Each structure stands twice: as structure tokens, then as C-alpha cells.
Design a protein around this nucleic acid. Structure first.
Ligand SMILES: [K+]
Ligand SMILES: [Mg+2]
Ligand SMILES: [Mg+2]
Ligand SMILES: [Mg+2]
Ligand SMILES: [Mg+2]
Ligand SMILES: [Mg+2]
Ligand SMILES: [Mg+2]
Ligand SMILES: [Mg+2]
Ligand SMILES: [Mg+2]
Ligand SMILES: [Mg+2]
Ligand SMILES: [Mg+2]
Ligand SMILES: [Mg+2]
Ligand SMILES: [Mg+2]
Ligand SMILES: [Mg+2]
Ligand SMILES: [Mg+2]
Ligand SMILES: [Mg+2]
Ligand SMILES: [Mg+2]
Ligand SMILES: [Mg+2]
Ligand SMILES: [Mg+2]
Ligand SMILES: [Mg+2]
Ligand SMILES: [Mg+2]
Ligand SMILES: [Mg+2]
Ligand SMILES: [Mg+2]
Ligand SMILES: [Mg+2]
Ligand SMILES: [Mg+2]
Ligand SMILES: [Mg+2]
Ligand SMILES: [Mg+2]
Lengths: 116, 122, 86, 137
RNA sequence: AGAGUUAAAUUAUAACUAAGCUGUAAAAAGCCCUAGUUAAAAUAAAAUAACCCACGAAAGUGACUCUAAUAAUCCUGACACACGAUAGCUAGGACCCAAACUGGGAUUAGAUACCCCACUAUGCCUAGCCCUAAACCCAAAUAGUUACAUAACAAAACUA
């Protein structure tokens, strides 16, 4: 449930001292904020480290590191595939919640009335 | 009842436990207290190790004493139990039955508050 | 220090995986708010900043939980309009 | 297959023995993951240390030792020294919050050591020493 | 305002293992009488509850227990009486930890600053003084009205 907004803000007819001092007025806007892009992180680290172990153990020659080298290539392709497809599908995937453009139109049909 | 004595005793055999309660109740009667009854909560493992009288205790017995005593004699009872070595942690609180359960009607729903801002065009 | 060990904030792995068990532990701490608490105890915030932080956390929790209700309330009005080109 | 997250309480008798020994008999792996270093120590059920390893001792130096990879290598090294002394399962206790928590956990997994229980024992003062002031970076 | 009490953390200190430990955007300096684990006083500060809004005249108060206890049969009122965060002073006691000043490192053209390490006054207890704050909810006290009516902005306007 929503926290009570009774006797919180600084008002003339308020005996209780202020509890909340908002930066901007608590008025619902007719639009929601855009989704925030997820910050990236380095990929293929658990596979690069094991690759470096074989290189240091065999004088930097891939004559015996073939198993590790291929997985590093596989991880690079796997990370490449996911990175070059996340942006397009996430816009309309919606995770069950309408994209920001649809919510803005929905809110405009039923706007908030501060005046009158 | 007016006062309740949350008494915790060190784990020991039957004879010394009876002796410890016998003298603890005797100390209460010397200060001018009419004890009502003695309640036994059995022996239980302590929630955490309690350091008292240069000992580390992990198991102890719980006992409860309720009595009527003058207000000025509470400090003497607390001071006396602190010097005793067979009691690990004494505490005195007013008996919960002294206060009556205040009558309740229900969870009154608080409506959302309006008229918090001017009606000018934002 | 005085309590028993390996009871609080402890999870046990199942079927031999450890990444899944660790994520369960993090959800336990995040829900109880310990993760943010440890972040704020690395340095010291003056009581002036503590109240100013609780006046921004509470205000956000009111606006977010109120805009959330309006979205759910108006969610049913998203079907195809039956009076298109009326 | 009813599996309970909570540990088997010592007071009760749970028929869950790993490698023929009880829950409390299994050694402990302490992980102190600070913001600049990750220290891993494995101790026996009697709190007798078996092996010790950290990002500093593995060749990583200065800022490098605070990264995740350094903690991952320390987990591999600590497990190898532990496995040499003949330990299969270990109950890992995580101390503090840092960038090396995840790497050290899977470092022991890939080093030839198996974990069964995870505990977080981050120092959480209940009101305690006043910490240092803020950094106006 | 008194009296009694301590959960979590930290430190003196002891045992064991390890050779490094702290620190940053990156480093150096410092430490190696050190770090990790186990055992553990004193001092200081009061996680979650608190998405609650209570008490006091204000400044203030939110770890536990007990004692004492919150004026007026319920208007306004000073230069008079009483009080007043924090910093500061005088005397004694305490000192985990934080920390103006100061010393070292780094940055910079310079850095007597921001950043890093060490430590003092002091923050703490008892008795006295000082009586200052953006002491600001920038909105005086007591009774009321929603009538009349939008400079602007903000926390709508007004009468006795
Ligand atoms: K507390
Ligand atoms: Mg009031
Ligand atoms: Mg403003
Ligand atoms: Mg303690
Ligand atoms: Mg006092
Ligand atoms: Mg040096
Ligand atoms: Mg030490
Ligand atoms: Mg001392
Ligand atoms: Mg408040
Ligand atoms: Mg008054
Ligand atoms: Mg009154
Ligand atoms: Mg008067
Ligand atoms: Mg003063
Ligand atoms: Mg002062
Ligand atoms: Mg002073
Ligand atoms: Mg002078
Ligand atoms: Mg002095
Ligand atoms: Mg000092
Ligand atoms: Mg210091
Ligand atoms: Mg200098
Ligand atoms: Mg004020
Ligand atoms: Mg004024
Ligand atoms: Mg005023
Ligand atoms: Mg006046
Ligand atoms: Mg009055
Ligand atoms: Mg009024
Ligand atoms: Mg205009």
C-alpha cells in the first residue's frame, strides 16, 4: 500500500513539523520515463584466464592449447551474437509491461487534472 | 501481580537449584515483598553465551517470580541479585497483566490526502 | 560472536551447483537491505544527510507506487479500439 | 526430492554425511574479499589452518590484485594446496563485500575443491565504531 | 533527570598458519611489533522495526529495565525570571574510533587544496561558563470563514 501522505508536507494548517521536503511537487505527469540502457561488462573472462594458463605453461604455443583456443573463439562468437541482437528485440519484448511509447499514449487518454 | 522477576539460573542439579530459589525468595521477603507464585520454564539452551561472574554459560534454567513490592525497594533487589553468583542475568519488569488490553475496533483506512497544491495550470 | 555459527545468512547448494546458490544468498540480503546498508557504512554520512536521504527515498516510493497503481488500473484499456474510423 | 536451504542443526541428527563425515566435521574456507585484496584461508573443523592464499602471494601486485581475475587465480591456488592435504568438501564463509566474492567462490570449484554451504559473515555494526569521513572526489 | 544493564562491530592481549599488509582513476609513502583464523575486557556509538510520525515550550529525543514525571476549569503579554544544537574556555577522569592543526606521499606551472598514510585538540563522563546558527516549516499567538477573489513564484484566499 502507498505510504500515507497525511500531515507530512509543510502546510499552514499543519501542526506537525514537516517530515517530507520534496524537490519537485508530487504531481503525476502524463508520461513515464524511458527505459535505462543496461551497462555492459567484460565478457569471456572465465575462458580467457584458462587460455592464458596453457600459453604460460607451453611457451606461448598453441600446439597443445587447441581445446582452450577454440572455446575462446566460441565465447567470442557467443558474446557477439547476444550483443548484436539484444537491442532490437528488447524494445518490443516488453517483459510483459508495455513499452514507454505505448504507456505515454495510454496516459494521454486519461490525463491527470491538477487544475479546476 | 505488580512486578515480575525474569530470573535466569545457572544449570545445576536439583538440591542446589532449590537452595538458590529458597534464598532468592528469602531476599525478596526481607525487602518487604509479598510473592504470589513461582513459575518454572524449565532448562533451555541459552540463545547466546552470556558472561557473568567470570564464567561463560551456554545452558541455564529459567524461573519467573511475581510479587508486590514498594517502588523504592526495586534497586535493592536488583543490586542484591547482581552480587549473587548462581544467577546469571536478573531483570525486573512491571507485570504485563497490570495493563489492560485496550479495546480495538479495526484497521481504519486512511484516504489519500487532497488539496496539497494550488489549482494553477502546471 | 556469542551466537552459534553457520545458522544465520547461510544457504546450502543442491545438485552440485554453486552459482545458483550464491544468487539465492544475494536475494536474501537485498530483500533485507543489508547490501545497501554495507554500501552506506563504508563511509560516514552526517545526520543532516541521513534525513535528506530518507526524504528522497520516501518520496520516490510514494510516486512510484502511485504511478504503478494507475498503470495497472488503466491496463485493461489497451485492447484494440472497437470504434476505429468512427 | 525435498531439499532444505537451512543448514542441518547440530542439535538434531540429520542423515546427510559428505565423504563419511558429518556436517560440522567438514573444513571451513574463509574468504575475506576487501575492496583491494582477496584473502583465502582453509581451516579444519578444529580451526587448524591447512593452506593460505591471496592475490598478493600469487604474483598480482598493487591495483591488479583487486580485480576479479586475481581472486579467481587465488581460489585455484588455494584449492590445489588444500587438495594436496586431502580435503574434498569445504564450507565456505564469505567475509565482507568486494569485487572478489564471485571469482573466489568459483575459483575453489575449478581448483579441484567442492563446496556445499555458503555463509556471509560481513561485519555489520549495530549502531559501533564511527567510520571514516566521505571522499569528495 | 537519576540508578542499573548489553546485544552486533572494533581494540589491548594469546595461540596457529602465511610473507607480505594497507591504499588509489593510477601510484608512492606508511607498516612487516604485520595479515588471516580461534578465544576476549574497557571506552564509544545505538543495524532491521521506521513505507510508522509519537513526546517536549524551543533547541531536541527513537538499545533494554526500574524510580520520579510532562504548569493553567482549558485568551494576548516584555528590556523581567527560566532555558537554549554545535563549536569554544576552566578543573578532574576516560580514549575503541573519527578527527581541524601538523608531518610524509602523490597531483599541479605553484597545491601551505581536492586524493592517500600517521597522530593531537576535541567529539565522551562529572562540576562551572559561554548564550551564537540557513536557532528556517524563512509563514507570530488566540478564535474562526470558503464567502469576496488568481501580480509573479511558492506551501490557495481572508476576517476579529
Ligand atoms: K542498537
Ligand atoms: Mg507538537
Ligand atoms: Mg526547491
Ligand atoms: Mg560484544
Ligand atoms: Mg545525567
Ligand atoms: Mg614502498
Ligand atoms: Mg593482528
Ligand atoms: Mg585500554
Ligand atoms: Mg521524525
Ligand atoms: Mg505551550
Ligand atoms: Mg501540558
Ligand atoms: Mg501569558
Ligand atoms: Mg549552548
Ligand atoms: Mg559542546
Ligand atoms: Mg566541548
Ligand atoms: Mg580565556
Ligand atoms: Mg579539559
Ligand atoms: Mg585523543
Ligand atoms: Mg586514528
Ligand atoms: Mg604536505
Ligand atoms: Mg532546527
Ligand atoms: Mg526568523
Ligand atoms: Mg518562529
Ligand atoms: Mg507572541
Ligand atoms: Mg498556550
Ligand atoms: Mg489557528
Ligand atoms: Mg502568466
Amino acid at each position: 500500500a502507498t505510504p500515507s501522505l497525511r500531515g507530512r508536507l509543510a502546510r499552514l494548517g499543519n501542526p506537525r513539523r514537516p517530515i517530507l521536503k520534496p524537490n519537485k511537487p508530487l504531481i503525476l505527469a502524463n508520461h513515464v520515463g524511458e527505459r535505462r540502457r543496461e551497462k555492459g561488462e567484460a565478457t569471456c573472462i572465465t575462458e580467457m584466464s584458462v587460455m592464458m594458463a596453457c600459453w604460460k605453461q607451453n611457451e606461448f604455443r598453441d600446439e597443445a592449447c587447441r581445446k582452450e583456443i577454440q572455446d575462446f573463439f566460441d565465447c567470442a562468437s557467443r558474446a557477439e551474437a547476444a550483443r548484436k541482437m539484444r537491442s532490437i528485440q528488447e524494445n518490443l519484448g516488453e517483459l510483459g509491461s508495455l513499452p514507454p511509447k505505448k504507456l505515454n499514449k495510454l496516459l494521454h487518454r486519461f490525463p491527470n487534472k491538477p487544475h479546476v | 501481580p505488580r512486578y515480575e522477576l525474569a530470573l535466569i539460573l545457572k544449570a545445576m542439579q536439583r538440591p542446589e537449584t532449590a537452595a538458590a530459589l529458597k534464598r532468592t525468595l528469602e531476599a525478596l521477603m526481607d525487602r518487604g515483598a509479598v510473592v504470589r507464585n513461582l513459575e518454572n520454564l524449565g532448562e533451555r539452551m541459552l540463545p547466546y553465551k552470556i558472561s557473568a561472574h567470570n564464567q561463560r554459560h551456554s545452558r541455564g534454567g529459567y524461573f519467573l517470580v511475581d510479587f508486590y513490592a514498594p517502588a523504592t525497594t526495586v534497586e535493592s533487589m536488583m543490586e542484591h541479585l547482581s552480587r549473587d553468583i548462581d544467577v546469571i542475568r536478573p531483570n525486573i519488569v512491571k507485570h504485563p497483566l497490570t495493563q489492560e488490553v485496550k479495546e480495538c475496533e479495526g484497521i481504519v483506512p486512511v484516504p489519500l490526502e487532497e488539496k496539497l497544491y494550488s489549482t494553477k495550470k502546471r | 560472536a556469542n551466537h552459534l555459527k553457520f545458522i544465520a545468512r547461510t544457504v546450502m547448494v543442491q545438485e552440485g551447483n554453486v552459482e545458483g546458490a550464491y544468487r539465492t544468498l544475494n536475494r536474501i540480503l537485498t530483500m533485507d537491505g543489508l547490501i545497501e546498508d554495507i554500501k552506506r557504512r563504508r563511509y560516514y554520512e552526517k545526520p543532516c544527510r541521513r534525513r535528506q536521504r530518507e526524504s528522497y527515498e520516501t518520496c520516490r516510493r510514494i510516486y512510484n507506487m502511485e504511478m504503478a497503481r494507475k498503470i495497472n488500473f488503466l491496463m485493461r484499456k489497451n485492447r484494440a479500439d472497437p470504434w476505429q474510423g468512427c | 526430492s525435498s531439499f532444505s536451504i537451512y543448514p542441518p542443526i547440530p542439535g538434531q541428527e540429520n542423515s546427510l554425511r559428505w565423504a563419511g563425515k558429518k556436517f560440522e566435521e567438514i573444513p571451513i574456507a574463509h574468504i575475506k574479499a576487501s575492496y583491494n585484496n582477496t584473502q583465502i584461508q582453509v581451516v579444519s573443523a578444529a580451526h587448524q589452518p591447512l593452506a593460505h592464499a591471496s592475490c598478493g602471494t600469487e604474483g598480482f601486485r598493487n591495483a591488479k590484485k583487486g580485480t576479479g581475475i586475481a581472486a579467481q587465480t587465488a581460489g585455484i591456488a588455494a584449492a590445489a594446496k588444500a587438495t594436496g592435504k586431502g580435503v574434498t568438501h569445504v564450507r565456505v564463509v564469505v567475509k565482507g563485500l568486494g569485487p572478489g566474492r564471485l571469482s573466489a567462490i568459483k575459483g575453489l570449484t575449478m581448483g579441484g575443491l567442492e563446496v556445499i554451504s555458503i555463509t556471509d559473515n560481513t561485519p555489520i555494526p549495530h549502531x559501533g565504531c564511527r567510520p571514516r569521513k566521505a571522499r569528495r572526489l
